[PDB]
Amino acid sequence: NEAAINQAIELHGFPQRHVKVGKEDGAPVRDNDLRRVRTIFDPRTTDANTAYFTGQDVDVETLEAHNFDYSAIHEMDMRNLTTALGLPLEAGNVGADGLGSGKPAELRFALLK
Amino acid sequence: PDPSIDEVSKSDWDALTTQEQDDIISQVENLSSTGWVNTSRERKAEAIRSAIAERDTLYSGNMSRLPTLDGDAEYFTLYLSAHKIQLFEGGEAQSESGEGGSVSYSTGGGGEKDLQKTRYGRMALEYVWEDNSIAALRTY
Amino acid sequence: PDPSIDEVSKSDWDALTTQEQDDIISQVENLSSTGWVNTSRERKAEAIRSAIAERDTLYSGNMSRLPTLDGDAEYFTLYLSAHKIQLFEGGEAQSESGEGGSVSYSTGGGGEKDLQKTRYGRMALEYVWEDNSIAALRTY
Amino acid sequence: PDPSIDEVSKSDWDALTTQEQDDIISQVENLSSTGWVNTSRERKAEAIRSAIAERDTLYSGNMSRLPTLDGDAEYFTLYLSAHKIQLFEGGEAQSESGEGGSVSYSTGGGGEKDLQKTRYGRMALEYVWEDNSIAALRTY
Amino acid sequence: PDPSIDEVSKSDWDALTTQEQDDIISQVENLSSTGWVNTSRERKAEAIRSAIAERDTLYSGNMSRLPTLDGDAEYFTLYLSAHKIQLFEGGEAQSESGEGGSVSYSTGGGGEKDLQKTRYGRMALEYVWEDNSIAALRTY
Amino acid sequence: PDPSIDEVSKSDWDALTTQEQDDIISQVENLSSTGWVNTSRERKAEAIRSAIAERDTLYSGNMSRLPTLDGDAEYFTLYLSAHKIQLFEGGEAQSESGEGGSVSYSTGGGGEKDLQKTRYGRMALEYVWEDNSIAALRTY
Amino acid sequence: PDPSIDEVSKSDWDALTTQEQDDIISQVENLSSTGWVNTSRERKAEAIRSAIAERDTLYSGNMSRLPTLDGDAEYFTLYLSAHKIQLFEGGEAQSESGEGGSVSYSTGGGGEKDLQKTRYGRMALEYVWEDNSIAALRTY
Amino acid sequence: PDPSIDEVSKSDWDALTTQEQDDIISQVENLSSTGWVNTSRERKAEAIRSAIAERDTLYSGNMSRLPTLDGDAEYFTLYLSAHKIQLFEGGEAQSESGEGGSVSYSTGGGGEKDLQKTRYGRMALEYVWEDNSIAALRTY
Ligand SMILES: [Mg+2]
Ligand SMILES: [Mg+2]
Ligand SMILES: [Mg+2]
Ligand SMILES: [Mg+2]
Ligand SMILES: [Mg+2]
């Protein structure tokens, strides 16, 4: 699960840029052309205040980061692992609502003792 | 033909013997039942030379590392030649009428762009992904 | 025919005897009542050779673990041959008229793409998933 | 007929006697008031052989647990044969005109896919779920 | 007729005497003023046999806990037969013209599906839920 | 007529005397100025017998506590009979012409469905909620 | 030609010998079966000179460092010349009629722009990205 | 010509010798195969003078610090002149018919602005950004 999250964050946790070249139903672009386009919009040489100038027939589309609740996956992973190992979930750096006060707290510490 | 139409570029076509050109012309003339017999050799030669140059410049190289000419380069160049020959003559007839006898050839609207406008073009168009752009590249 | 049209590629067609080619041509001519009898042998041979090449280039391979040619490859190659022959004669007669009287063949405008433009094309089209982009692939 | 048209595959049709083929051809000829009498035997035989091959490849197997051909396979093959005896003679007559005497046959445009383009096709199409895609499958 | 058209399946139709078939054919011929008199017996018999087989295969069984054929099966089979006979004669006359004068029969374009295309078809179509997918089923 | 057309079912029609059938036929013939005088007795009788059976099967029962046939069942069966008779001879004439005389009858498109396509059908249609699906039912 | 048509600009064309100009004209005259023989030499010279100037002004430079003229500049200039010559003769023939009989050339309406309006224009249009604005530029 | 049409303004045109004007007129007369021989000198001179004045007023100055006339000013002024000469006679010919026979040109189908109405207009239009409003300016 940790490996799956680590990979998924790289693929989907970061936005990515998709340059679409040429008009819909227009003249077809070839990859020797895309080499020259890639050389312009290169993230390797782009900066925070860069501006782009084009004809109407070029689009800079965005793969928006397809957000997912990896935090809850972490809490589930930690819940399973700690409770399998017989530890309180708090030892795994994970909290819970309501259970942080009174004898509803003390019971886990009693079980540990 | 001995040198095939896919084996020759514009400069090569100019280097061929008259017979080698004529064999290729004879192959192109198979694509119409009329053989375009009322159009001169020079015009058929120019159409072929043009089709060869146009293939090599507009229908060459790659997109996404697929070849942009997917089909048989022989028949592509022949169909592109036949497209050119037909356009040297007003294009396709939607109808022909003579001494009372008449016919109509179901061509229809036929789109708007070059290869759409004649039957040989419409055949050649399947060889080159229907003029679509499947092109893709990435950062490295 | 002894070598069937699906059992040969373009290079094999060029290697066939005249009788083997003539048997295949004779089979293709069965696809029309008119037999394309006024069109010469060379033109019918060219259309067949082209259909064989076009099958092996544009209609070979796979879409998912399916073949891209689902129907019988014999009849597909024959229909593709007949499609080509009909285009060599100028396409579908939508209407004909003369001292024999007159007829109209209910084509409408039809589609835009070559196989949509003739009856043999529209028959061939069903063999090849109707030209649909049905392929799928995954990482492993 | 003794062997019915639904009892024979492509290789079986080729194994029949001329009489058994002629009985089946005679049955197909019942589907037009004209009997297609100006088209030769070889062409009617080819249309039937094609209908058999096309049935066994494009109209065979299952779509869910159901068969992809629901109706009587005899009459399906006959209509698919008649659909291929038409089209070997051009399309449907929208209109026919002789010595002044004239008729028009109310076909409409019909559609775009081959079976939509003639009445025999439009009948055969009803037997095969109207080319609908009702197939379904589960993980196990 | 002593055996009615709704009482016989395809196997039974083949077992009838020629007189029992002729009685049923005679009943079908009542569905047109023209009787289809210039179409031969074999063609009318084939259309009836086909209509019987098509009823029993495509227009049989249940659609919810009720029959898919709601109307009188006698008249349904007659209308389905008349539809097929009319298609064997080329379909609906939209218009007729000659030295008798001229007429137009008000059809419009009609629908797309076979039963929609002719008057006998449209009469048959009301008997069978207008070809609608009205069936329902549940888990138990 | 002495037994009225609304008082008889299909089995009753077969039980009537020739005169009782002829009285009902004579009543149906009142619905056209032409009387359909060139169409034989058997065909007018078959149309009536069919209309009786079709009323009793397709136009019987209830939609809520309403009858599905709201109008006068006599005139409904007559209009349904006249509809069938007209369809036994090509349907509506949009236009008729001969010897330099001509007329056109304002029929238009006339919808798509059976009863919509002729004037007698359209009269009958008003008797049967215009074929609308107005039935309602509840749990108890 | 010794100096081919892409080796020269407007001021070079004006400096060529009549023989060099006339050979280039002779190459342009290959692009029609009719050769534009009934249009005078000076009109063809004007169209070529105009095409040379128009190429160098309207169809020169770059878009995202791609050349604005992707195809062979020879055939582009020839097509642009032939387009202009055809416009000097009043444009396309959509249809022609006379004692030679009649013909219609399947144009449809076409596009609105000059290069869309004639066949030589449409052939030229493919060489120049179909007049699209693919240009892209950045801050540095 | 000695002074080129792009080297002269309206006051310069009025200052030219008759020979220099006639040279420029002769250049404009190259743009039609008919040469407009039935329209007098004064009217062609007026069209040229008008084209010069209209260039200098409506097609002068800058647009996003590009010139509003991007193409060759010689050929722009010639095409604008030819456009005016054409409009001094009528529209474009859509159809022309003689004592016998006819030709039609597909000259229509464009937009409604004056330059869109004729072939010379549609050529001139490309030289001037197709009347597009690509101008831009900023605070400083
Ligand atoms: Mg395709
Ligand atoms: Mg109804
Ligand atoms: Mg159906
Ligand atoms: Mg293109
Ligand atoms: Mg432009």
What residues of chain G lie within 8 A of the CB of A37, using their CB? 64, 136
DSSP state of E65: S
- Report the alpha-carbon distance of residue F85 to residue F124 in Å, rounded: 14
For A11-50, give one letter per residue: b (16+ CB within 10 A) or e. ebeeeeeebebbbeebbbbbbebbeebbebbeeeeeeeee
Angle at alpha carbon of residue F41, lines to F102 and F33, rounded to 5°: 35
Closest CA to C92 of C76, C80, C108, C81: C108
B90–G93 C-beta distance less than 8 A = yes
Give me G68's structure tokens: 């604005």
- Report the alpha-carbon distance of residue A69 to residue H77 in Å, rounded: 67
Give me B106's structure tokens: 């179901």
Between the CA of E114 and the centroid of ligand 3 the distance, in Å, is 8
Which member of D42, D45, D93 has the closest CB to residue C106? D93
Give me G106's structure tokens: 């399947």
What residues of chain D lie within 8 A of the CB of C92, using their CB? 90-91
Element (H, E) at E129: none
- Report the alpha-carbon distance of residue H28 to residue H88 in Å, rounded: 14
- Report the alpha-carbon distance of residue D71 to residue G38 in Å, rounded: 67
Give me C17's structure tokens: 């005897």
Angle at alpha carbon of residue A50, lines to A49 and A52, rounded to 5°: 140
- Report the alpha-carbon distance of residue E49 to residue E53 in Å, rounded: 6
Closest CA to H91 of G83, G111, G90, G110: G90
Q: Are B69 and B127 in contact (CB under 8 A)?
A: yes
- Report the alpha-carbon distance of residue E71 to residue F61 in Å, rounded: 13
Closest CA to E127 of E88, E79, E91: E79
| Residue A12 distance to chain B (closest CA, Å) | 17
Q: Is C6 annotated as contributing to ligand binding?
A: no
Q: Are C1 and C24 in contact (CB under 8 A)?
A: yes
Question: What protein residues have CB closer than 5 angstroms to ion ligand 3?
Answer: D 126; E 131
Give me E52's structure tokens: 């019987």
Q: Which residues contact H24 (CB under 8 A, 6 or more apart)?
A: H1, H3, H5, H16, H48
Alpha helices in chain B (DSSP H): 10-15, 18-28, 41-58, 73-87, 119-124
Contacts 24+ apart (CB under 8 A), F67-75: F68/F128, F68/F129, F69/F127, F69/F128, F70/F127, F70/F128, F70/F129, F71/F126, F71/F127, F71/F128, F72/F6, F72/F127, F73/F6, F74/F4, F74/F5, F74/F6, F75/F127
| Residue found by looking up tokens 């590249």 in the block | B137
Give me A37's structure tokens: 């386009």
Q: Which residues contact C92 (CB under 8 A, 6 or more apart)?
A: B105, B106, C86, C105, C107, C110, C117, C118, C119, D90, D91
- Report the alpha-carbon distance of residue G15 to residue G6 in Å, rounded: 15
| Residue B123 distance to chain A (closest CA, Å) | 18
DSSP letters of C70-109?
-S-HHHHHHHHHHHHHHHHTTS--SEEEETTEEEE----S
- Report the alpha-carbon distance of residue G51 to residue G28 in Å, rounded: 11
Query: By CA distance, what is D98's nearest residue in C?
Result: C101
- Report the alpha-carbon distance of residue G54 to residue G13 in Å, rounded: 13
Give me D81's structure tokens: 């044969």
The count of other CB atoms within 10 Å of the CB of residue G15 is 10
Element (H, E) at A9: none
Indicate the annotated binding residues of F for Mg(2+): 70, 126, 130-131
SS3 of C56, please?
A: helix
Please report the resolution in angstroms: 2.4
Minimum-distance ligand to the CA of E127?
2
Q: Dihedral through CA G4, CA G10, CA G13, CA G14, nearest 10?
A: 180
**Residues facing F104 on adjacent strands:** F95
What residues of chain B lie within 8 A of the CB of C56, using their CB? 72
Distance of CA A13 to the CA centre of its chain: 1
Q: Are F95 and E103 in contact (CB under 8 A)?
A: yes
- Report the alpha-carbon distance of residue C70 to residue D53 in Å, rounded: 12
- Report the alpha-carbon distance of residue G126 to residue G131 in Å, rounded: 8
- Report the alpha-carbon distance of residue B21 to residue B1 in Å, rounded: 9
The count of C-alpha atoms lying within 13 angstroms of the C-alpha of G113, restricted to the half-sphere facing its C-beta, is 18
Query: By CA distance, what is E109's nearest residue in F?
Result: F109
Structural method: cryo-EM
Interface probe, candidates B43, B49, B55, chain G, greatest G C-beta count within 10 A:
B43
DSSP letters of chain D?
--S-TTS--HHHHTTS-HHHHHHHHHHHGGGSTTTTTTS-HHHHHHHHHHHHHHHHHHS-SEETTEES--S-HHHHHHHHHHHHHSBBTBS--SEEE-SS-EEE-------SSGGGGSHHHHHHHHHTGGG---------
- Sheet strands (E) in chain E: 95-98, 101-104
**Residues facing F103 on adjacent strands:** F96
- Report the alpha-carbon distance of residue E127 to residue E58 in Å, rounded: 13
DSSP letters of H35-78?
TTTTS-HHHHHHHHHHHHHHHHHHS-SEETTEES--S-HHHHHH
- Report the alpha-carbon distance of residue E60 to residue E78 in Å, rounded: 16
DSSP letters of G100-134?
TEEEE----S--SSHHHHSHHHHHHHGGGGGG---
E109–D31 C-beta distance less than 8 A = no
Biggest CA pair distance of chain B: 69
Q: Are B55 and B127 in contact (CB under 8 A)?
A: no
Interface probe, candidates B27, B30, B31, chain C, greatest C C-beta count within 10 A:
B30
Give me G124's structure tokens: 């030229």
C30–D87 C-beta distance less than 8 A = no
Q: Is D130 annotated as contributing to ligand binding?
A: yes
Amino acid letter, H43: R
Q: After which residues is chain G broken (C to N over 2.5 A)?
A: none
Q: Exposure of D14 by Cβ count < 10 A (0-12 exposed, 13-18 middle, 19+ buried)?
A: exposed
Query: By CA distance, what is D27's nearest residue in E?
Result: E46
Closest CA to H35 of G30, B27, G42: G42
CA distances for C113 relative to B116, G2, G130, angstroms: 8, 41, 20
Closest CA to C119 of D50, D25, B33, D78: D50
Q: What are phi and psi of H61, to 5 degrees?
A: 85, -175
Contacts 24+ apart (CB under 8 A), D31-36: D31/D78, D31/D79, D31/D82, D31/D120, D31/E43, D31/E46, D31/E88, D32/D82, D32/D85, D32/E88, D33/E38, D33/E39, D33/E43, D33/E88, D33/E89, D33/E90, D36/D85, D36/D89
The count of C-alpha atoms lying within 13 angstroms of the C-alpha of F100, restricted to the half-sphere facing its C-beta, is 0
Q: Are H99 and H27 in contact (CB under 8 A)?
A: no
Biggest CA pair distance of chain F: 69
Element (H, E) at E120: helix E119-125
SS3 of C16, please?
A: coil
Contacts 24+ apart (CB under 8 A), B99-104: B99/G101, B100/C97, B100/C98, B100/C99, B101/C97, B101/C98, B101/C99, B102/C95, B102/C96, B102/C97, B102/C98, B103/C93, B103/C95, B103/C96, B103/C97, B104/C93, B104/C94, B104/C95
Q: Which residues contact E55 (CB under 8 A, 6 or more apart)?
A: E69, E73, E76, E77, E80
Give me F39's structure tokens: 């169409």
Q: What chains are in contact with C, requiring at least 3 Cβ pairs below 8 Å?
A: B, D
What residues of chain B lie within 8 A of the CB of C57, using their CB? 70-72, 127
DSSP state of B102: E
Element (H, E) at H101: none
Q: Which residues contact E108 (CB under 8 A, 6 or more apart)?
A: F109, F110
- Ramachandran category for residue E13: left, alpha or beta (phi over 0 → left; psi -120 to 50 → alpha): alpha
Give me G18's structure tokens: 């009549």
Closest CA to H94 of H109, H106, H79, H78: H106
Q: Are E73 and E114 in contact (CB under 8 A)?
A: no
Q: Exposure of B21 by Cβ count < 10 A (0-12 exposed, 13-18 middle, 19+ buried)?
A: buried
Give me E80's structure tokens: 């389905």
**Residues facing E97 on adjacent strands:** D102, E102
Q: Are A20 and A58 in contact (CB under 8 A)?
A: yes
- Ramachandran category for residue H101: left, alpha or beta (phi over 0 → left; psi -120 to 50 → alpha): left
Element (H, E) at F31: none
Closest CA to B129 of A27, H93, D33: A27
| Residue found by looking up tokens 């009043």 in the block | G90
Give me F55's structure tokens: 């009323």
- Report the alpha-carbon distance of residue F135 to residue F132 in Å, rounded: 9
SS3 of G136, please?
A: strand
Both ends of chain C: CA-CA distance in Å? 45
- Report the alpha-carbon distance of residue C70 to residue C134 in Å, rounded: 12
Element (H, E) at F19: helix F18-28
Q: What are phi and psi of A69, to 5 degrees?
A: -85, 65
DSSP state of F96: E
Q: Exposure of H93 by Cβ count < 10 A (0-12 exposed, 13-18 middle, 19+ buried)?
A: middle
Altogether, the residues listed in chain H come to a count of 140
Query: By CA distance, what is D49's nearest residue in C?
Result: C75
What residues of chain G lie within 8 A of the CB of H70, using their CB? 57-58
Q: Are E13 and E60 in contact (CB under 8 A)?
A: no
Q: Are F23 and F1 in contact (CB under 8 A)?
A: yes
**Residues facing C63 on adjacent strands:** C66
Which member of B54, B93, B117 has the closest CB to residue G122? B117
**Residues facing G63 on adjacent strands:** G66
Q: Are C31 and C79 in contact (CB under 8 A)?
A: yes
G137–A54 C-beta distance less than 8 A = yes
Q: Is H130 annotated as contributing to ligand binding?
A: yes
- Report the alpha-carbon distance of residue H107 to residue H110 in Å, rounded: 8
Label the pairing between strands G95-98 and G101-104.
Answer: antiparallel
- Report the alpha-carbon distance of residue C48 to residue C46 in Å, rounded: 5
DSSP state of E67: B
Q: Are B139 and B127 in contact (CB under 8 A)?
A: no
Closest CA to H75 of H16, H28, H33, H117: H28
What residues of chain G lie within 8 A of the CB of B113, using their CB? 122, 125-126, 130
DSSP state of F59: S
G135–A54 C-beta distance less than 8 A = yes
What residues of chain B lie within 8 A of the CB of A43, using their CB? 139
SS3 of F104, please?
A: strand
- Report the alpha-carbon distance of residue C140 to residue D44 in Å, rounded: 51
Q: Exposure of D56 by Cβ count < 10 A (0-12 exposed, 13-18 middle, 19+ buried)?
A: middle
Closest CA to H25 of H6, H47, H8, H7: H47
Q: Which residues contact F9 (CB under 8 A, 6 or more apart)?
A: F52, F53, F56
C102–D91 C-beta distance less than 8 A = no
The count of C-alpha atoms lying within 13 angstroms of the C-alpha of C109, restricted to the half-sphere facing its C-beta, is 8
Q: Are E129 and E69 in contact (CB under 8 A)?
A: no
- Report the alpha-carbon distance of residue B118 to residue C122 in Å, rounded: 18
Q: What are phi and psi of F104, to 5 degrees?
A: -135, 140
| Residue found by looking up tokens 């342009």 in the block | G28
SS3 of A25, please?
A: coil
- Sheet strands (E) in F14-131: 62-63, 66-67, 95-98, 101-104
Both ends of chain G: CA-CA distance in Å? 45
- Report the alpha-carbon distance of residue B120 to residue B101 in Å, rounded: 26
| Residue C2 distance to chain B (closest CA, Å) | 26
